[PDB]
Design an enzyme around this catalytic site. Sequence first.
Site, short mmCIF file in Angstrom:
data_model
loop_
_atom_site.label_atom_id
_atom_site.label_comp_id
_atom_site.label_asym_id
_atom_site.label_seq_id
_atom_site.Cartn_x
_atom_site.Cartn_y
_atom_site.Cartn_z
N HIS A 93 0.73 -1.29 -0.26
CA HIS A 93 0.10 0.03 0.19
C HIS A 93 0.85 1.25 -0.04
CE1 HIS A 93 0.43 2.54 3.78
NE2 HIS A 93 0.65 1.03 4.28
N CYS A 94 0.23 2.33 -0.36
CA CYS A 94 0.81 3.72 -0.76
C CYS A 94 -0.15 4.58 0.27
CB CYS A 94 1.54 4.00 -1.61
SG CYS A 94 0.45 4.17 -3.25
N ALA A 95 -0.53 5.94 -0.28
CA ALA A 95 -1.67 6.73 0.02
C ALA A 95 -2.86 6.41 -0.82
CB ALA A 95 -1.06 8.03 -0.09
#
Length: 149
Positions: A93-95
């Site tokens: 995941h990231c933002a």
Amino acid sequence: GVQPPNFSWVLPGRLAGLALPRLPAHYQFLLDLGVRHLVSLTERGPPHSDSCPGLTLHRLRIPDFCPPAPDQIDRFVQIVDEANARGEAVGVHCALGFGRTGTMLACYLVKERGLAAGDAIAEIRRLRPGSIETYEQEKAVFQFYQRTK
């Protein structure tokens, strides 16, 4: 369990992408699907991750709006390989789950599925429309392919 935003499998039962998890129910959801490892690409760790001691968090911090560094991609790959070796799935995941996440996902396809960068980027965009939107992101995948052959 509550499915995290923008969550979807790239490699069924092995690798999945998602946006920023922020609730205990998100992590519990991951554990329920067999996703025992979470690779976190955000500038800061995702909130409430410690609610699930059984999920292993792998921090690979990459600045917002920037591409992953070569060594980081190699580490990401290593993490997915080792997790799957143990019969466990990995979530990354990231933002928003499209840029940094999309680039990592595409890089694993290059390495694990032998795809050319262009085709790896296309498949990720097909599965997760909106992924790898920037040139630097595409660049990261192409250069990875170059050193992966």
